Amino acid sequence: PPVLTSKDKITKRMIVVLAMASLETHKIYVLLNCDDHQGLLKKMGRDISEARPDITHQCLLTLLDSPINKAGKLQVYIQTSRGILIEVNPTVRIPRTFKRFSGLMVQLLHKLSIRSVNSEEKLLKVIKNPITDHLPTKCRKVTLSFDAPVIRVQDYIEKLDDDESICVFVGAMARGKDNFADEYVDEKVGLSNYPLSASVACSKFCHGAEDAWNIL
Amino acid sequence: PPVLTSKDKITKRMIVVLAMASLETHVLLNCDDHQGLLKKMGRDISEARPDITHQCLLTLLDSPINKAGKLQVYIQTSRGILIEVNPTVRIPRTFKRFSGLMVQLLHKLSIRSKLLKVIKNPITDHLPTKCRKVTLSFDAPVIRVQDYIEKLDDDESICVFVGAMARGKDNFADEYVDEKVGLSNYPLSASVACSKFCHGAEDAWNIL
Ligand SMILES: Nc1ncnc2c1ncn2[C@@H]1O[C@H](CSCC[C@H](N)C(=O)O)[C@@H](O)[C@H]1O
Numbered sequence: 001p002p003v004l005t006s007k008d009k010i011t012k013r014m015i016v017v018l019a020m021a022s023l024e025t026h027k028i029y030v031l032l033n034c035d036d037h038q039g040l041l042k043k044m045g046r047d048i049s050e051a052r053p054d055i056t057h058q059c060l061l062t063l064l065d066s067p068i069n070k071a072g073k074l075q076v077y078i079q080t081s082r083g084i085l086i087e088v089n090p091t092v093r094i095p096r097t098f099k100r101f102s103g104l105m106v107q108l109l110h111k112l113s114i115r116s117v118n119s120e121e122k123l124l125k126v127i128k129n130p131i132t133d134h135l136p137t138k139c140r141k142v143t144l145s146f147d148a149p150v151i152r153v154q155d156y157i158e159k160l161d162d163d164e165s166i167c168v169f170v171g172a173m174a175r176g177k178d179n180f181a182d183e184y185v186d187e188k189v190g191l192s193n194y195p196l197s198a199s200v201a202c203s204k205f206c207h208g209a210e211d212a213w214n215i216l
Numbered sequence: 217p218p219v220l221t222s223k224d225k226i227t228k229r230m231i232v233v234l235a236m237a238s239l240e241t242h243v244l245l246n247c248d249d250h251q252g253l254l255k256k257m258g259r260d261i262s263e264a265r266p267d268i269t270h271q272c273l274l275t276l277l278d279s280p281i282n283k284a285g286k287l288q289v290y291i292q293t294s295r296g297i298l299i300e301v302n303p304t305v306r307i308p309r310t311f312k313r314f315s316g317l318m319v320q321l322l323h324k325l326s327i328r329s330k331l332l333k334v335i336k337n338p339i340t341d342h343l344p345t346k347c348r349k350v351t352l353s354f355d356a357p358v359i360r361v362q363d364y365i366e367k368l369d370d371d372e373s374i375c376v377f378v379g380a381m382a383r384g385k386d387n388f389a390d391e392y393v394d395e396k397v398g399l400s401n402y403p404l405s406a407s408v409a410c411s412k413f414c415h416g417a418e419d420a421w422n423i424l
């Protein structure tokens with residue numbers, strides 16, 4: 001199982017893009033968050049409710065822990081709400097606790113990439129917009145939305161062409177319209193008759209893709 | 217859906233038990249913040265991982281199976297405390313706010329608006345009358361959850377024990393369980409084991 005990156009535009013895979021991710025640093029440098037920085041966000045005149053980097057953190061853990069990741073058939077990108085685009089190497093160990101995650105994101109946003117000790121390989125890297133320049137050549141692009149017709153993921157995946165990847169844009173936000181990828185996507189689809197958290201929408205999509213692709 | 221509790225011995229449901237869960241107050245003890253204290257407490261600092269319990273609870277209670285009313289969660293902490301989770305509790309999304317809620321629960325023994333409730337061990341005295349008990353573990357044969365679930369009788373619940381511990385043998389349920397099963401050829405985090413079970417049961421029970 002070779003490690004997938006944007007250089008490979010052929011291999012059929014699943015891609016998840018965590019869009020409108022709230023990853024923004026402020027010098028106290030910390031990753032702005034609604035719990036710790038209410039006072040600051042308020043005196044900044046920002047919407048207190050929108051600084052939710054915990055959503056991106058939880059989605060990353062969900063996604064990189066999944067069997068489809070371990071089987072080498074997942075890539076994740078992050079598009080932040082400030083327009084930064086980040087390619088996540090499949091093998092990166094995202095810190096399990098929010099505090100260490102926050103430290104890692106500050107370093108990434110400042111330096112533009114993170115490598116390991118011992119290796120030049122970038123495990124996280126800021127790359128140039130737009131995301132469509134990096135995705136596979138044959139890639140169905142979908143936004144997940146409560147407001148769109150509900151699909152069974154297995155069925156949807158089984159309808160892909162044999163050489164066609166699937167890129168899912170998921171809003172990594174507490175609230176907002178699901179229009180964040182309307183210029184890239186082919187279709188919007190819902191996964192449930194209930195509204196879901198971004199992380200659960202991620203897990204549900206991954207599970208369905210695992211099932212359709214016989215990844216256990 | 218009417219809210220499932222252990223009082224109802226009959227309704228077919230999925231139950232997940234977060235076993236060996238690290239939930240202890242001093243704040244919630246955790247490896248990131250309390251390394252110095254843990255080593256004065258002669259503890260393996262790497263065991264204090266309430267983040268795992270936090271993540272599993274978000275995964276479980278956010279799942280369509282919960283929203284359809286067909287899920288119950290219990291937590292068995294590493295100090296032997298048993299907690300029944302009310303299906304309608306809103307788990308705080310951030311770890312800092314999660315800690316604040318657990319602290320209250322552990323001290324007062326109950327949270328209400330009973331959203332969270334300390335109950336008497338063992339967990340098997342609370343389970344539905346007809347209930348298969350399974351431990352999820354990388355070390356057992358690998359099932360497709362949908363198929364395994366479809367094999368339950370029409371009146372038979374399933375209770376899944378998931379290790380919410382940092383590492384360790386999956387023997388935390390050995391004297392309680394009917395069977396051990398694997399969910400993957402790859403090692404899984406506890407929260408991923410949970411979603412895999414929830415999602416396979418959603419597919420088996422036509423919950424969308
Ligand atoms: N039932 C559903 N089906 C598919 N995706 C969903 C969903 N419910 C939520 N999502 C996805 O999960 C993300 C975060 S949910 C928060 C934003 C959402 N627009 C709202 O107002 O509630 C959404 O952006 C969307 O990408």
Ligand SMILES: Nc1ncnc2c1ncn2[C@@H]1O[C@H](CSCC[C@H](N)C(=O)O)[C@@H](O)[C@H]1O
Pocket residue numbers: 351352353354355377378379380381382383384385386397398399400401402403404405406407409
């Ligand atoms: N491949 C797999 N199949 C089924 N369950 C798994 C699994 N991998 C992990 N789990 C569940 O997730 C829990 C946490 S993973 C950490 C515990 C693991 N026994 C270890 O020492 O490495 C496990 O206790 C198990 O209940």
